[PDB]
Each structure stands twice: as C-alpha cells, then as structure tokens.
Design a binder for these strands. Structure first.
Lengths: 181, 57, 124, 49, 77
RNA sequence: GUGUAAGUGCACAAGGGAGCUUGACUGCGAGACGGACAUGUCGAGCAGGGACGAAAGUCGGGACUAGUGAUCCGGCACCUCU
RNA sequence: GUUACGGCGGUCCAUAGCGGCAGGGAAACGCCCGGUCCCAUCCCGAACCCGGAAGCUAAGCCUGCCAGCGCCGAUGAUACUACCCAUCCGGGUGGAAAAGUAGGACACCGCCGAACA
C-alpha cells in the first residue's frame, strides 16, 4: 500500500509541475526531501521536566522518538550553559513523512483556532518552507486533558525545488492552505 | 526497525462531519476515529455613510 | 541549476577523504603490497599496489566475464573475485599483503571478499 | 585533601603495589583496576587500600 | 617592577644538518610543535623530537607543503 | 576550538562524537640531545603478560614546553640477604 | 596500438584551484528502486549496510574553449649588506632583495583495468 499523499504526488502533482515549468530532464521534478519539527523549550534551562514533556508531545504527534538538542554555546542573558537540553527535533522521511503531512494538512491545520491560512512568503531562495505553531492542541494524537502547558513548533519542509516559486507551486499543489498575495 | 522505541499503530476509521469512513492506520485505539472538521468540510477548502442611510435615509 | 551539492558529491568526497585518512597507516611494499578494494553498487575491484614504485602487481574485478558467469549474489561475486586475486598473487609470488579497505566499512561484500582472499592462502 | 596518593595492592597476595592518585570526592569508593603482577607473570586486579 | 621573571633557554633547533651522516637513534631536531615533520626513516618523540630510525645522511625535503626530514641510506663501500 | 599563560603546532586533524578498555605496564635498552658537576630530555628495538582492531598495527599517560625539592634521618609492604 | 572511459600513485602539491561557456553514458562511474537478509540512526534505510536495475546523464565524472578571479613569475635597477678605504660626508670590491614589470598558466608524468584493433 502507498500513502494517499505520496500516490497523489507520484501520479498527478508530478505531471502538473512538469507542465507548469517544462523541465528539460525527467529528474528536475521538485519533490519533498524531509520534514523537521523543532520544539525549542528554552525555559528548560531551569527544569529538565519541560524537555521531557516536549519529548512526549513530539513522540505522540510525529510517531517516532525525538532527539534532544544540546546547547552548543554558553550565554548569560539566557543563563545558558553548554550541554543542557534546550529543545527537541525529529527528522521525518519517506512513508512516515507522507503520513504526517497528510495528518497535518487534513486535520491539524483546520483545527487551528481562527485559522486564516499560512503566508506563502516564508520560503527562502530554495523553496524550503518553514512556519511555526504556538500550541499542540490541534493534533488529536495528544489529549487536551493530558496537556498542561502550550508548546509551539517550527515545521520546516525542505524540498528538491531550486526557486521559491517552484516550492510554493509544489506546496500549493500538495494542498497547503496558503493565503493570497 | 527497533521494536521497543516507538508506539503502536492500528488501522482506524477517521470520521468527519461529511460522513466518510477513512480506513487508514492511526495510533488512537478507539478503532474508529471521529473528528468534527477536516479538509472535506472546512470553509477554507470549500462605511459610516451607509449606516446613516440605514438610520435616516 | 541545483542550489547545493548532489548526494553523489557528499558520498564521493567523504569516501576519498576517509580512504586518505587510512592510507596514513597502510602502504604497500614489494614483498608486502597494499591490496586496495574499490566497491560500487554493481561491481567490486581489487589491485595489488607496491606504493614505493607506484605499480600494480595483480588485479581482479567482477568486470571479468569468467567471474561474471557465476549466478550468485553480490557477495558471491566478491568472494570469487577474492579467490581470483589470491591465486593471481600466488602466481605473482606475493605471500603477505595488507588489506586496504578503500574507505569503505569492513563488512558485507568487502568483508566476504577479504575473508575469501584469507582462506585462499593470503596471510593478512 | 584532594587527589591524595593512593595505594592499590594486588588481590592475590604478594602485596605487590602500584601507586597513583585520584579525586577522593569524584571516586569516594575504593578503586579497582587490573594490572600486571610481576611475580605471577599475570594480569590480576588491584584493590585500593 | 612586576617584570624580571623568565624561563631557562631550551636549546631547541636542528642538531644535524643536510648531508650529515647519523646513526640510528640520533636526535635530528629539537622542536616544540611539528615545524618539521618526520619523513622516511625518521620518527617523532613524545616532545615532538625527530630522530633517525636507520643510519644514513640527513635530507630536508618538502612533502605536500610541509617541511620534512628524511634519512638517505648511504651506499655501503 | 584545542582543560589551564604564551609561543610553536594541529582542518590529513593534535578539534567534535561513539564502542570496548586500563600500556597512568614489568625486565631492559643500541644510539643520542643538553650540559662545570649534580640534575634533565628523547629513543628504535628485544622479552613477558595484556587492551583495542578483521588485519596491518598502536599503546611504557595527557598536541608540546610549567604543576616542583638533592642528601641525611625515619615510616610502611615484600625478599631464597645478614 | 587507439577511446569525450574507470581506478591506484606522484610533483620543492594551484602553472594544477575556482568561475563561465559548449558536450557525452560502450563497458565503467554514478544518480536511482526497496528495506526481505548482514548491518545503522545520540531521532530519521538521510547517511552506513544489504538486496536489484525501471528511468536518467539533470548532477557527480571526465572532454574542448575562455586569463575572468586566484596562482606562478623573470632581467634590469634599487633597498640592504661582508670586507676595505675614508678625519665627517661618502667611496671601492663582492653578495643581493621584497614590491613591481615582461611573461607563464584553464596542469604534467607513471602503473593497472574497461571498450575497440
């Protein structure tokens, strides 16, 4: 079996992009590469338990155990020291990537309160989109009664595209609820 | 695939307000999953002078 | 025009770099030549190098039709290639060699062919 | 003090000795390491005294 | 005045120069870093000291941008 | 960036990470550097018994150069000495 | 012996690098397909490893051309300097820079193997 988003991209999105941009060789078609969800606690510098709550939230939402990022620089304004856990990170590739993308697009984004769309201006040169949530309640993989403190994210979708226009085209064809500019 | 480092998976029917049985794997153990809204039914996927005229005309 | 490097660049540069980093401790002589392996996704190749003179005493590969005729897996092809290099070294008079893994992990096909050279009469 | 010279004798009699130092607060418990013993010609572990 | 303190001279430098014949074990240079790198038949000590591993004549060469010291096995009479 | 001053080095890494481990060994040591002397420093290699490694091999503390005190006197452990 | 071929090495390791333009996939070199087996992720079959060849030269790779950026670089002269004259000033004999300029340069050599003879 194939995830429906991946099957859709294989069949119709590829031909749509090929018609739109007229790539010289078959393997210029821009595709998704990986998805990274970053949850930087920052406040975990005092109490470690915040990093554990972040670990559980990420593991529940993505489905795989997240990796704790160490602080690679000491700072005094944030009373940071090298080596304590600051934030988590998950790299999603392949089938798990596609499933997660389907879940997010079709369930999580519409569940956001007074959702008005995500700006299509967040790409950077190579068409790797990155937005950020403020809480984790949109996903039903978590329990509202279980959660106690909001924890936002930074979802970044790195693609094979070379330009911002191609990246936004691929994401819009995928079903991203962009705004209009 | 490491056996004991990740949670469970199960084919669950995802339900929306439109009335669609969505047979696909999920982690929720309800067997059938119900959501109120999704892409199929979401709306995104789917002057003072005037006030004077209303009041007095 | 792709924005960054291709994955082939990363792989090739990393392999050349980590082959060079192990060539520090491994160098071949006339009586103790360096047996360097080059492995692709489709084939495997070996040579016997005397590093002082920069020559090659013996060589073997899965390109050769005689070893291509075997129907075994990639591991079987590597095993037979190891046998070929072993008996060619025997015909070359070289008895002891030093195994140069060419920057690849000593496992799978390369380990199979190195073992194959070992029990075929090459002490290394 | 800190890092005092410590004495570790061979476990199997002969009271053969090596000396070294360690943090007595990083390693408060007695140190155990395996070392060559000349008379036995063998590698036995040595217990800090 | 705060100043007035200095350490002893360490007598570092090159001990045998190019063309000098040496015996095995003979110290070639006394250096702190690896200003000269070991070449053929030349080893490196704990304090980055170069010494001869075989008898012969000292030869200063450059290998891949680094100055190196090698020993040439002078021909037996 | 290299625990620590400075300098000489180190990107081939000597810098960052991971697995196993105790060579932070015993008997020695060709040949040397430096030196009034006393001090000090490097050292291939041999043997025993080990660690890591598929193997070649490397390991007689730490990238290197500071982190120390002669003789006398006395304490402790062992010795097929008296 | 030949080929726009693949590897292993070199050279007081850029005269070689970088950049631009134009090409190619015979065997090879790769990208590529998948995670069933050896094996792997401080999470991720991304990488490592394994199993295959549907597609592709878009990249890598290599081929030809550009001095463009970097790089190499004289001779002469000068700075400086050993010795000797010279009361100072300076001079004679010998050595001789750096910078700059003319220029060079889009690498060269070696050993195997592929395909062709």
């Amino acid at each position: 079996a194939l995830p429906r988003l991946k099957q859709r991209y294989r069949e119709e999105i590829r031909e749509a992009l090929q018609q739109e941009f007229n790539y010289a060789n078959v393997m210029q078609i821009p595709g998704v590469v990986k998805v990274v969800v970053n949850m930087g606690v920052g406040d975990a510098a005092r109490d470690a338990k915040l990093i554990n709550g972040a670990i559980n939230d990420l593991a529940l939402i993505t489905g795989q155990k997240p990796e704790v990022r160490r602080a690679r620089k000491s700072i005094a304004q944030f009373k940071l020291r090298e080596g304590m856990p600051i934030g988590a990170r998950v790299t999603l590739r392949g089938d798990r990537m596609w499933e997660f993308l389907d879940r997010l697009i079709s369930i999580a984004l519409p569940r956001i309160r007074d959702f008005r769309g995500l700006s299509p201006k967040q790409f950077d040169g190579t068409g790797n989109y990155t937005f950020g949530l403020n809480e984790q309640s949109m996903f039903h993989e978590i329990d509202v009664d279980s959660i106690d403190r909001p924890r936002g994210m930074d979802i970044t979708v790195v693609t094979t595209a070379t330009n911002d226009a191609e990246g936004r085209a691929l994401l819009r064809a995928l079903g991203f609820p962009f705004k209009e500019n | 695939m490491k056996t004991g480092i990740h949670p469970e998976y199960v084919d669950t029917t995802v339900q929306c307000g439109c009335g669609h049985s969505f047979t696909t794997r999920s982690t929720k153990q309800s067997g059938t999953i119900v959501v109120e809204v999704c892409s199929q039914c979401h709306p995104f996927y789917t002057g003072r002078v005037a006030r004077f005229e209303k009041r007095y005309g | 025009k792709p924005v960054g490097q291709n994955i082939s660049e990363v792989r090739r540069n990393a392999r050349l770099r980590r082959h060079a980093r192990l060539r520090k401790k491994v160098a071949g002589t006339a009586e103790v030549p360096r047996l360097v392996v080059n492995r692709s996704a489709r084939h495997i190749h070996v040579q016997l190098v005397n590093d002082l003179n920069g020559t090659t005493l013996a060589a073997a590969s899965s390109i050769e039709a005689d070893v291509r005729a075997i129907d075994g897996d990639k591991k079987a092809h590597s095993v037979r290639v190891g046998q070929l290099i072993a008996e060619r070294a025997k015909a070359a008079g070289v008895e002891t060699v030093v195994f140069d893994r060419g920057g690849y992990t000593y496992g799978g096909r390369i380990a199979a062919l190195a073992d194959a050279a070992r029990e075929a009469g090459l002490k290394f | 003090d800190v890092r005092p010279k410590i004495t570790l004798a061979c476990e199997v009699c002969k009271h053969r000795n090596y000396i070294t130092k360690k943090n007595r607060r990083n390693d408060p418990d007695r140190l155990e390491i395996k070392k060559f013993c000349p008379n036995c010609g063998t590698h036995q572990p040595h217990k800090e005294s | 005045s705060r100043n007035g303190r200095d350490s002893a001279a360490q007598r570092l430098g090159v001990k045998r120069f190019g063309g000098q014949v040496v015996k095995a074990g003979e110290i070639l240079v006394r250096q702190r870093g690896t200003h000269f790198h070991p070449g053929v038949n030349v080893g490196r000590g704990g304090d980055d000291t170069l010494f001869a591993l075989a008898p012969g004549a000292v030869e200063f060469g450059a290998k891949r941008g680094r100055k190196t010291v090698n020993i040439v096995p002078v021909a037996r009479p």
